[PDB]
Design an enzyme around this catalytic site. Structure first.
Site, PDB file in Angstrom:
ATOM      1  N   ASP A   1      -3.619  -9.016   4.286  1.00  6.98           N
ATOM      2  CA  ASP A   1      -2.419  -8.757   5.083  1.00  6.98           C
ATOM      3  C   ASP A   1      -1.399  -9.894   5.016  1.00  6.98           C
ATOM      4  OD1 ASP A   1      -0.541  -7.934   6.866  1.00  6.98           O
ATOM      5  OD2 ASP A   1      -1.794  -8.107   8.668  1.00  6.98           O
TER       6      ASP A   1
ATOM      7  N   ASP B   1       5.007  -6.788   3.886  1.00  4.60           N
ATOM      8  CA  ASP B   1       3.872  -6.621   4.790  1.00  4.60           C
ATOM      9  C   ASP B   1       2.825  -5.698   4.167  1.00  4.60           C
ATOM     10  OD1 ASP B   1       2.150  -6.571   6.908  1.00  4.60           O
ATOM     11  OD2 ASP B   1       3.455  -5.340   8.225  1.00  4.60           O
TER      12      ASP B   1
END
Ligand SMILES: NC1=N[C@@]2(c3cccs3)CN(c3ncccn3)C[C@H]2CS1
EC number: 3.4.23.46
Length: 391
Positions: free
Chosen positions: A234, A38
């Site tokens: 992201d 992440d």
């Protein structure tokens, strides 16, 4: 092009909808867990108690090297939450650098809509900066620990590989989903040149978009709109998410370009799948999308261009069929632009923390057709690019 990081190539599994994960070990003796990569957060957090969707979890009582920090952490977010207990332990990445470091670990004891049934991951590796760590910026992120304790260069790179068709849980397990190269750039993973955009500020991986085109047509908004209130890279978000106003303009343009077929509102809202007879997806009716990014040289930009093979996300049909089905993977945001996994699947993305920049090159595993490919091209003369940043 030689590939100099063979140990780390093909170390990811997963898909854009559920995330891409890497194998890690925690504790002594090592406990193996699969961990979501992440770039949109900064905590290393692992399941540490039984959960209906976990087949394994970190057992602190079985690790001789566990240290308790005697402090809780509570992490609510829009779509879900986790909470847990902070500690440190020894951590390794088996298909990684050949090093073991002592890192912070949040042992998750309670959660809601965090674990995904059948995703195959048991924790999350937040690769962004300390500023957005929970509970605060004193909790050193994993990558910061790795660099401080070792000679691993302050850089990592991601090649997320979308299949272009649906995968079930067993197929994910057996398929390579990409590469996370810790400490370097592997030249086998991309074609053409790497182009770099500055990291505007070290919190998220924040960048500045300076122009948007749909099939070469300028969306023609004030560029601050594109970065309102930030733009980030992201891997933990599936979609390309755009600020409301930008989403509305972009969807209007994409509908106009694709207007030879009418799609229902639920498709454009990213909710409803669309299906075509096997092999007949009409890629050519859908436009390419270009995002121009600030370059490293004064008054220079470059563009990254994605295909519908990136922004239409393959999904299984709601009923048994051989149709090829997809959801529209561009959606609205109230928290800025998010260049999520479906856009990262087009590119090899270099997170060059040492030089405060992010590199993009066409991915060697991007999905395309015989007529069109993704692209990274430049330079373009672009004025007043700093003005595109929101304050
Ligand atoms: N990139 C993303 N990561 C999260 C994911 C959760 C599950 C998969 S991705 C963790 N998260 C978060 N936010 C603040 C502080 C820490 N984490 C927000 C959430 C959705 S978007």
């Amino acid at each position: 092009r030689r590939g100099s990081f063979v140990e780390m190539v093909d170390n990811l599994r997963g898909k854009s909808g559920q995330g891409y994960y890497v194998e890690m070990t925690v504790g002594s003796p090592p406990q193996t867990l699969n961990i979501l990569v992440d770039t949109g957060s900064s905590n290393f957090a692992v399941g540490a108690a039984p959960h209906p969707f976990l087949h394994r979890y970190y057992q602190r009582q079985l690790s001789s090297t566990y240290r308790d920090l005697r402090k809780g952490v509570y992490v609510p977010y829009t779509q879900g939450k986790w909470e847990g207990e902070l500690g440190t332990d020894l951590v390794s990445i088996p298909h990684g650098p050949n090093v073991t470091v002592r890192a912070n670990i949040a042992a998750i004891t309670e959660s809601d809509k965090f674990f995904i049934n059948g995703s195959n991951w048991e924790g999350i590796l937040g690769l962004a900066y300390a500023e957005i760590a929970r509970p605060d910026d004193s909790l050193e992120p994993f990558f910061d620990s790795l660099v401080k304790q070792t000679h691993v260069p302050n850089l990592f790179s991601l090649q997320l590989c979308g299949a272009g068709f649906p995968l079930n849980q067993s197929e994910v397990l057996a398929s390579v989903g990409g590469s996370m190269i810790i400490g370097g750039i592997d030249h086998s993973l991309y074609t053409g040149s790497l182009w770099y955009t500055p990291i505007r500020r070290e919190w998220y991986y924040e960048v500045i978009i300076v122009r948007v085109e749909i099939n070469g047509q300028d969306l023609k908004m004030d560029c601050k709109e594109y970065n309102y209130d930030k733009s980030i890279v992201d891997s933990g978000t599936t979609n390309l998410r755009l600020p409301k106003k930008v989403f509305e303009a972009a969807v209007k343009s994409i509908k106009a370009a694709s207007s030879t077929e009418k799609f229902p509102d639920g498709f454009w809202l990213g909710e409803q799948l669309v299906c075509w007879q096997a092999g007949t997806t009409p890629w050519n009716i859908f436009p390419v999308i270009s995002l121009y990014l600030m370059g490293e040289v004064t008054n220079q930009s470059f563009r990254i261009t994605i295909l519908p093979q990136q922004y239409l996300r393959p999904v299984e049909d709601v009923a048994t069929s051989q149709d090829d089905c997809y959801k529209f993977a561009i959606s609205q945001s109230s928290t800025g632009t998010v260049m999520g996994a479906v856009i990262m699947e087009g590119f090899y993305v270099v997170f060059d923390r040492a030089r405060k920049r992010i590199g993009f090159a066409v991915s060697a595993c991007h999905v395309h057709d015989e007529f069109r490919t993704a692209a990274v091209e430049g330079p373009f003369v672009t004025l007043d690019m700093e003005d595109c940043g929101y304050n």
